[PDB]
PDB file of C-alpha atoms and ligand atoms in Angstrom:
ATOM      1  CA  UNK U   1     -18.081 -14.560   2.417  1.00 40.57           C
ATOM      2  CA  UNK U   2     -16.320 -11.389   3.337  1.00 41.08           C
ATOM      3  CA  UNK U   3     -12.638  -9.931   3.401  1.00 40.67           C
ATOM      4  CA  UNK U   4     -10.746  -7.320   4.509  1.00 40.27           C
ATOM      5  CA  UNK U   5      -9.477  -5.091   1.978  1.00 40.17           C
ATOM      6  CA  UNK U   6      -6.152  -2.700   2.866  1.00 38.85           C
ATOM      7  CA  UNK U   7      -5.596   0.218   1.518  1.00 40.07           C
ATOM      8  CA  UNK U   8      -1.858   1.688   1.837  1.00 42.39           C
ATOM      9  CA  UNK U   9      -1.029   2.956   5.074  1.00 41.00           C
ATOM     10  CA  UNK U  10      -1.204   6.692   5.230  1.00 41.77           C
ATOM     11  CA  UNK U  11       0.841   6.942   8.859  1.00 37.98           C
ATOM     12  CA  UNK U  12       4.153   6.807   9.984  1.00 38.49           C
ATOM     13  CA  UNK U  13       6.554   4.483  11.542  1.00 40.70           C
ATOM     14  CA  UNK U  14       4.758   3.979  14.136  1.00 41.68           C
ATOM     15  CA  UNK U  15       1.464   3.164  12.462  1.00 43.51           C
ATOM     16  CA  UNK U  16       3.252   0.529   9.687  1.00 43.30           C
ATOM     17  CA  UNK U  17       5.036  -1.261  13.257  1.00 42.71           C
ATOM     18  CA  UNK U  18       1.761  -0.849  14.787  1.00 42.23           C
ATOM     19  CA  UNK U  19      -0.235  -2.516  12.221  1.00 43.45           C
ATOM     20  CA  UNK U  20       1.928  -5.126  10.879  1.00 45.25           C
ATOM     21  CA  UNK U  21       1.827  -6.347  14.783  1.00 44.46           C
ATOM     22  CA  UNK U  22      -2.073  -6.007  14.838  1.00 44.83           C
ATOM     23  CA  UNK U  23      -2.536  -7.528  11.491  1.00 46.93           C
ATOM     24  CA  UNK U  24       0.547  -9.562  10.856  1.00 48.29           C
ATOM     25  CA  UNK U  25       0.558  -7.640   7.760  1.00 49.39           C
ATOM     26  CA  UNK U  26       1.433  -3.445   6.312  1.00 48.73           C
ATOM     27  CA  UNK U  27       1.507  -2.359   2.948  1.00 50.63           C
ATOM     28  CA  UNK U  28       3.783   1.091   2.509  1.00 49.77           C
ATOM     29  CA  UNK U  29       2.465   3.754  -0.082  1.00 49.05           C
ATOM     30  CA  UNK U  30       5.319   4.729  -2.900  1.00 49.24           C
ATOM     31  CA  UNK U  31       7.633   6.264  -1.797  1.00 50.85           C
ATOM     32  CA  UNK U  32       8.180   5.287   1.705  1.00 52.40           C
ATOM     33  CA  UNK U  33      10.967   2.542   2.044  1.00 48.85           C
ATOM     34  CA  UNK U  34      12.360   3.033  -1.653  1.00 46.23           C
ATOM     35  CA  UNK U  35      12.394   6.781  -3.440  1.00 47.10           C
ATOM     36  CA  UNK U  36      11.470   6.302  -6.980  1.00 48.36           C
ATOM     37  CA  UNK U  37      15.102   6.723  -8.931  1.00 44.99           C
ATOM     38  CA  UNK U  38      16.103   3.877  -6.747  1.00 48.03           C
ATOM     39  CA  UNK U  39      13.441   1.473  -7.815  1.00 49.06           C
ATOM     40  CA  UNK U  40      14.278   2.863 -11.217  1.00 49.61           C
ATOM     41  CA  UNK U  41      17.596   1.681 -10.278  1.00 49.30           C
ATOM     42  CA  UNK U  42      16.837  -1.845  -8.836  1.00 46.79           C
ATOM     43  CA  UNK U  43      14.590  -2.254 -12.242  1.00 45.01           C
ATOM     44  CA  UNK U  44      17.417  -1.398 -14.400  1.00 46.08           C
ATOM     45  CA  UNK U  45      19.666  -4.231 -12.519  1.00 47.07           C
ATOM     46  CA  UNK U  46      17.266  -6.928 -12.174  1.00 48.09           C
ATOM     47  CA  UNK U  47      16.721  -7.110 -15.813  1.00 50.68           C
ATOM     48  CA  UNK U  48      20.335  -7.785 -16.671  1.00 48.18           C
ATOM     49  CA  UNK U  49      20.020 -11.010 -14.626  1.00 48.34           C
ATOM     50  CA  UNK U  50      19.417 -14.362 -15.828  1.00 47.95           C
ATOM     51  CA  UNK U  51      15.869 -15.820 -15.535  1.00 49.85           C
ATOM     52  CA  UNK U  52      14.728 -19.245 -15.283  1.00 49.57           C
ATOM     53  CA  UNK U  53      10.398 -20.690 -15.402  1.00 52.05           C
ATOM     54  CA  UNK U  54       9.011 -21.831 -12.193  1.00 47.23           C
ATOM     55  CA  UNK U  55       5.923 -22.178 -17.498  1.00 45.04           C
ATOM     56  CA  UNK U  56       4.081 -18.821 -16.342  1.00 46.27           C
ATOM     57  CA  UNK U  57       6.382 -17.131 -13.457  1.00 46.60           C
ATOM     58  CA  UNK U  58       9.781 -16.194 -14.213  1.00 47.73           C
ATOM     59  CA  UNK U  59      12.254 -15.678 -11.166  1.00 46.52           C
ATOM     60  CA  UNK U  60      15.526 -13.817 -11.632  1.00 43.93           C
ATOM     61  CA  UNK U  61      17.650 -15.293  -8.166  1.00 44.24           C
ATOM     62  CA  UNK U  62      19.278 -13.001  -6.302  1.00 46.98           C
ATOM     63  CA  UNK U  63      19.998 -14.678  -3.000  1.00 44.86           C
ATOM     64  CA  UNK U  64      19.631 -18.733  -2.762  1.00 42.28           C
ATOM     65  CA  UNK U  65      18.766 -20.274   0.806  1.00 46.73           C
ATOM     66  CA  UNK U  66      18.503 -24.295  -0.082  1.00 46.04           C
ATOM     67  CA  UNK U  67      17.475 -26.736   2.790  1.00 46.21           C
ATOM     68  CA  UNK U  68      20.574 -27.280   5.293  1.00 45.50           C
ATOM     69  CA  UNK U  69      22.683 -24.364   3.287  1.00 46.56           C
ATOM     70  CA  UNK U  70      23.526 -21.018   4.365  1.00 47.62           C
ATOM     71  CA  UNK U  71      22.385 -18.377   2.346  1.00 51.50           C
ATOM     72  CA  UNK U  72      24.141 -17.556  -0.486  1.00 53.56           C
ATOM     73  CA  UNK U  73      24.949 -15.083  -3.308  1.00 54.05           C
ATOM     74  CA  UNK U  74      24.057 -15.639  -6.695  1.00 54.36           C
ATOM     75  CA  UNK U  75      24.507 -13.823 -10.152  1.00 51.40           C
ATOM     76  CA  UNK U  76      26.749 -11.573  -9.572  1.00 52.76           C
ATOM     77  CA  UNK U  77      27.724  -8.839  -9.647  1.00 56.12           C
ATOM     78  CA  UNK U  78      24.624  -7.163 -10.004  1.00 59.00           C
ATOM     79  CA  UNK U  79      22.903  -9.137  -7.551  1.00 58.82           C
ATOM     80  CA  UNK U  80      25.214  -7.710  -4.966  1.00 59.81           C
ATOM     81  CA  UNK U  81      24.436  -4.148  -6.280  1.00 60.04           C
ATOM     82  CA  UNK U  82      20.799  -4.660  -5.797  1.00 60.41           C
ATOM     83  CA  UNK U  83      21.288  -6.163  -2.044  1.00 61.05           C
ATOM     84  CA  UNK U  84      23.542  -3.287  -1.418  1.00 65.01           C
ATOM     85  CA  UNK U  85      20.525  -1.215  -1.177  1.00 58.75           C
ATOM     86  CA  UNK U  86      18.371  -3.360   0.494  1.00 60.16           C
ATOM     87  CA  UNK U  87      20.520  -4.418   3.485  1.00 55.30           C
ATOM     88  CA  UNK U  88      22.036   0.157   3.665  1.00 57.51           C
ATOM     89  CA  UNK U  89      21.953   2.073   6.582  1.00 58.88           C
ATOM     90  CA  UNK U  90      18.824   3.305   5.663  1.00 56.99           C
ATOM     91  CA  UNK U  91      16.986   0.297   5.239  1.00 59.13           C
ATOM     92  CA  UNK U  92      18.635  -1.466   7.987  1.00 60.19           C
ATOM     93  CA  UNK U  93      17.329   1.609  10.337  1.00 60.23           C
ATOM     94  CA  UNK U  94      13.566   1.345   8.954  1.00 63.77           C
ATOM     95  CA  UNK U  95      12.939  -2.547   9.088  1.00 66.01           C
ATOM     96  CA  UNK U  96      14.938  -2.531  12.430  1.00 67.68           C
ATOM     97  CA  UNK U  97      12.014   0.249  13.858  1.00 66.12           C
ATOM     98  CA  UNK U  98       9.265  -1.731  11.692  1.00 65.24           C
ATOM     99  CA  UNK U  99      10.580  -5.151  13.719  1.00 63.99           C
ATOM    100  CA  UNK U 100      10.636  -3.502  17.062  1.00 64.84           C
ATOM    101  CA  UNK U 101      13.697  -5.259  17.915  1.00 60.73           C
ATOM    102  CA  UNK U 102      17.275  -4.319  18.420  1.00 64.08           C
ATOM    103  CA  UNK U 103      18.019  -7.471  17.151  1.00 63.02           C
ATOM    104  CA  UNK U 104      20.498  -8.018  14.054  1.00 60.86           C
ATOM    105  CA  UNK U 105      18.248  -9.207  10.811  1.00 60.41           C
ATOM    106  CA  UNK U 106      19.614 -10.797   8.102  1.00 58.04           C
ATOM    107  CA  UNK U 107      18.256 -11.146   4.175  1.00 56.90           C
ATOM    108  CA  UNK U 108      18.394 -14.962   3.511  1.00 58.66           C
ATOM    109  CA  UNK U 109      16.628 -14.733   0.162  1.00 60.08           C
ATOM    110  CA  UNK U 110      15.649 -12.714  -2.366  1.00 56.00           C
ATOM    111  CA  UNK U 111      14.545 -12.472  -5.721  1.00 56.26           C
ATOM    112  CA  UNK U 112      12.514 -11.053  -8.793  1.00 55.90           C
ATOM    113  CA  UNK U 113       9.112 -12.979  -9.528  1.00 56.91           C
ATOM    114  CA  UNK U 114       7.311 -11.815 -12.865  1.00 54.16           C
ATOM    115  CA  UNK U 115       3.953 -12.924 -12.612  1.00 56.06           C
ATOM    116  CA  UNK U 116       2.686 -13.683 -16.542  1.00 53.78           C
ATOM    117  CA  UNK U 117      -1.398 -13.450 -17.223  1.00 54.16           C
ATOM    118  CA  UNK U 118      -3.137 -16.407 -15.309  1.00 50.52           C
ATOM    119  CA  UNK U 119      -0.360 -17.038 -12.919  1.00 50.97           C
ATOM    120  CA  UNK U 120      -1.546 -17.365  -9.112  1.00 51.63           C
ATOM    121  CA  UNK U 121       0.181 -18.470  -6.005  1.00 52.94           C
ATOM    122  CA  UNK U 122      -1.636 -21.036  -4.623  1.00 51.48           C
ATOM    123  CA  UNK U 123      -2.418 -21.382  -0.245  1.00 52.88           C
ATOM    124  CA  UNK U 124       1.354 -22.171   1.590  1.00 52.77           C
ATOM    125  CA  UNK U 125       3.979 -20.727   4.262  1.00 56.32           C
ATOM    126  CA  UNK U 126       7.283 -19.139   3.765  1.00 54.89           C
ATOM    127  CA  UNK U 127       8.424 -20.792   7.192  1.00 50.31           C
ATOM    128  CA  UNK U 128       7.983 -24.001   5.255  1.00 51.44           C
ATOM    129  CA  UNK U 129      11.119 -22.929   3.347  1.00 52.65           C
ATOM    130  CA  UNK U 130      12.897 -22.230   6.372  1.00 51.77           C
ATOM    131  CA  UNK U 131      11.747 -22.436   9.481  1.00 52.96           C
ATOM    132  CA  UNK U 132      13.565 -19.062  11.000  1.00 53.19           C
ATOM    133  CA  UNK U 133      12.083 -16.732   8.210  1.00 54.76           C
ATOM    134  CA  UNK U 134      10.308 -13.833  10.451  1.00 51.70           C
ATOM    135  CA  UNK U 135       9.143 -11.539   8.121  1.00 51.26           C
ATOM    136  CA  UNK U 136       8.959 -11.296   4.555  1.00 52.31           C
ATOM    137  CA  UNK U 137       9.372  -8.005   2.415  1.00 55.88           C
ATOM    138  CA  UNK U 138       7.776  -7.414  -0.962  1.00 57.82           C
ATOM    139  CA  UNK U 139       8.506  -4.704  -3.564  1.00 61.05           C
ATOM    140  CA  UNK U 140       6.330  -3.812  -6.427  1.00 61.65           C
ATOM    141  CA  UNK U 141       7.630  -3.272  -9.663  1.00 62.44           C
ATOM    142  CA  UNK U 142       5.185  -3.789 -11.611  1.00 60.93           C
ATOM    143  CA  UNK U 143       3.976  -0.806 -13.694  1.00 60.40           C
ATOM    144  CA  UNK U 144       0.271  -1.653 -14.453  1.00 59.37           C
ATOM    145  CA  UNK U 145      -1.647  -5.127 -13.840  1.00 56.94           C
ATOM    146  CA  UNK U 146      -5.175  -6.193 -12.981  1.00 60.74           C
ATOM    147  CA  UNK U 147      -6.036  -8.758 -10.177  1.00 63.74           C
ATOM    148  CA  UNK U 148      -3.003 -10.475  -8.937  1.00 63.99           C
ATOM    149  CA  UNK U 149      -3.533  -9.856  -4.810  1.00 64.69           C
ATOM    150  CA  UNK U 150      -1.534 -10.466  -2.451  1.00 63.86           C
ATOM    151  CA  UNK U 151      -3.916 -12.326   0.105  1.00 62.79           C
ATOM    152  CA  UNK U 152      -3.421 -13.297   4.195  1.00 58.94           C
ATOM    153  CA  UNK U 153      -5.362 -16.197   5.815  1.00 57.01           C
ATOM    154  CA  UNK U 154      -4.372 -15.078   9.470  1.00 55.88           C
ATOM    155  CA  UNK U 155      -6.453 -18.139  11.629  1.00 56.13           C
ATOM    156  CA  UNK U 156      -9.775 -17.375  12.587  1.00 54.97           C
ATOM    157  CA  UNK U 157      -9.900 -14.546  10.672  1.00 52.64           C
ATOM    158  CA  UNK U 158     -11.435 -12.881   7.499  1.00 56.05           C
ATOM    159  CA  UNK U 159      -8.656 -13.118   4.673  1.00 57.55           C
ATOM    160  CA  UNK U 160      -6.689  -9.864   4.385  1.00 55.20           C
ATOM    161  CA  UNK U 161      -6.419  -8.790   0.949  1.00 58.20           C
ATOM    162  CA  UNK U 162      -3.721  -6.433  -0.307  1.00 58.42           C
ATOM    163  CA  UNK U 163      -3.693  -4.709  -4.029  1.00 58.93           C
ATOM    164  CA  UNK U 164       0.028  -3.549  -4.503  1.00 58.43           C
ATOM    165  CA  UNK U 165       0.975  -0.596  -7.175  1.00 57.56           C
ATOM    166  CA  UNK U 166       3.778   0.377  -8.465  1.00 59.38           C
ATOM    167  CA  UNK U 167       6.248   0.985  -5.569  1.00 60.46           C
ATOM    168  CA  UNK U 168       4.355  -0.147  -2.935  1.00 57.23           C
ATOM    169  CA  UNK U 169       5.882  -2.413  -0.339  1.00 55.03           C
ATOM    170  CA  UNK U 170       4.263  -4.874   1.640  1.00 53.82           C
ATOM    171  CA  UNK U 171       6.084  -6.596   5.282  1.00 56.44           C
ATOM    172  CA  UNK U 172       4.269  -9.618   6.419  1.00 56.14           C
ATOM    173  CA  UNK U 173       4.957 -11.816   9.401  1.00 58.80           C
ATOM    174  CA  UNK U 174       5.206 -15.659   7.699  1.00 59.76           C
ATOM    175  CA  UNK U 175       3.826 -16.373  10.788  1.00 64.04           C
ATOM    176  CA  UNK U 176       0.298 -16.602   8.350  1.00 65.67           C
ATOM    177  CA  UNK U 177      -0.402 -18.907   5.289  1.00 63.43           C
ATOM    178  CA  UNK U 178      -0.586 -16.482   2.259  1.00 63.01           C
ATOM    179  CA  UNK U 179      -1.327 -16.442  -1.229  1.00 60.50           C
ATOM    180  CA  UNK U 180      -1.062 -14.479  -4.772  1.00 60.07           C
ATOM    181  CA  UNK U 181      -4.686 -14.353  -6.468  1.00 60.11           C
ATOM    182  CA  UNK U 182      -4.761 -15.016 -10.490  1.00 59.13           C
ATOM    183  CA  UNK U 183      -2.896 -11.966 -12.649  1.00 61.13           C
ATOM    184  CA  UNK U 184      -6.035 -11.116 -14.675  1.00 61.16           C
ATOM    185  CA  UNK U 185      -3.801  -8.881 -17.107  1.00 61.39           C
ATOM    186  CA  UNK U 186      -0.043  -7.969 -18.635  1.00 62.58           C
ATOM    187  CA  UNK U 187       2.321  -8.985 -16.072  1.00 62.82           C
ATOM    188  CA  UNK U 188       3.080  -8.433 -11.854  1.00 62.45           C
ATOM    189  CA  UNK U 189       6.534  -8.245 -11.126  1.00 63.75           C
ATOM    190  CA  UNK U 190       7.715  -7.919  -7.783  1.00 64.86           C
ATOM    191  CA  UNK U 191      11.104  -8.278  -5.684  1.00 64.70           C
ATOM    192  CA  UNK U 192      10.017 -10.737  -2.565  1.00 65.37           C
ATOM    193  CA  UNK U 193      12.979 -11.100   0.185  1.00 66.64           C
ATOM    194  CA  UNK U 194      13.035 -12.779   3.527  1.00 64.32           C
ATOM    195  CA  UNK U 195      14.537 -11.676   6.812  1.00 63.02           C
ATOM    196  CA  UNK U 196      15.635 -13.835   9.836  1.00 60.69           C
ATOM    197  CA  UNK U 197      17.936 -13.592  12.778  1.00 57.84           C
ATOM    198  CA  UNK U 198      19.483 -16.741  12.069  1.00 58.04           C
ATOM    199  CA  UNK U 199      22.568 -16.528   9.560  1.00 59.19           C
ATOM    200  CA  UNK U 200      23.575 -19.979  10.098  1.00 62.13           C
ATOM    201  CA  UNK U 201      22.265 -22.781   7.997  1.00 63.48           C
ATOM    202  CA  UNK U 202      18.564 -23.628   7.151  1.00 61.34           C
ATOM    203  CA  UNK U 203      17.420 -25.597   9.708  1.00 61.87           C
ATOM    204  CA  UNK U 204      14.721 -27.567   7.187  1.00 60.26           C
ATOM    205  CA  UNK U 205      16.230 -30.903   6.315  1.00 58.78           C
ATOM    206  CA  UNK U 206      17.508 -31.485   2.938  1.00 59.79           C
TER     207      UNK U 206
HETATM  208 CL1   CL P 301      10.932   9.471  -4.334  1.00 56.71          CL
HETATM  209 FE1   FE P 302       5.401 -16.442   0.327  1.00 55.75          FE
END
């Protein structure tokens, strides 16, 4: 009967820490984590990879993380190009300040969703996948789209409801079931990556 709808967070560091503690959940306003010629970039590279359905999303691998594997590289070379940027100096500096932890992370999986008209992502868990996924980053590459939400069901709590644009980047704890609501036009594509401490194998049972 009533959500809570987010607007970008118009703070700093420590607002975005701040709030993804609070609310489990902090969407970043273009260009924060990523200036624009390197999403340009990223764009360029994803689109020389190969996709495969999963038939109205598309998902162009970068990383792999099966049940009982360690996580593993896949399509190279550009894939590594792409991760290059994600896991930098930079990047490893902002997460490690958004995490509040001095704690090594590491990027088990990642990959390109593109989100076709009528799509959705129905009600689940990311920890379901793996058990030690702690947070869950989410870049937005898609130019122009209508509906498509990215949606938090935090327990005993109104749903939080996040509407990404173009190079916004949402962190969420997978601590919280979440959800993508129906793509109501073109297409949403988005780079989704996970981050845990653990680099050893998945700990779900293949
Ligand atoms: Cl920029
Ligand atoms: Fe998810």
């Amino acid at each position: 009967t009533a959500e809570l709808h987010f607007r970008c967070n118009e703070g700093g560091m420590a607002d975005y820490a701040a709030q993804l503690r609070e609310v489990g959940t902090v969407m970043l306003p273009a260009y924060v984590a990523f200036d624009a010629h390197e999403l340009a970039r990223i764009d360029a590279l994803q689109a020389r990879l190969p996709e495969e359905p999963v038939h109205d999303i598309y998902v162009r691998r970068i990383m792999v993380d099966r049940a009982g594997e360690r996580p593993q590289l896949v399509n190279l070379p550009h894939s590594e190009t792409i991760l290059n940027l994600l896991g930098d100096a930079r990047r490893t500096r902002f997460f490690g300040d958004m995490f509040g932890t001095r704690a090594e992370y590491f990027i088990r999986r990642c990959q390109i969703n593109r989100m076709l008209k009528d799509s959705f992502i129905g009600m689940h868990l990311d920890a379901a996948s793996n058990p030690d996924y702690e947070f869950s980053v989410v870049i937005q590459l898609g130019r122009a789209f209508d509906g498509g939400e990215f949606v938090v069901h935090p327990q005993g709590r109104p749903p939080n409801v996040f509407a990404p644009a173009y190079g916004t980047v949402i962190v969420t704890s997978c601590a919280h079931r979440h959800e993508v609501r129906t793509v109501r036009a073109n297409e949403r594509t988005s780079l989704v990556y996970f981050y845990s401490r653990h680099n050893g194998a998945n700990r779900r049972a293949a």
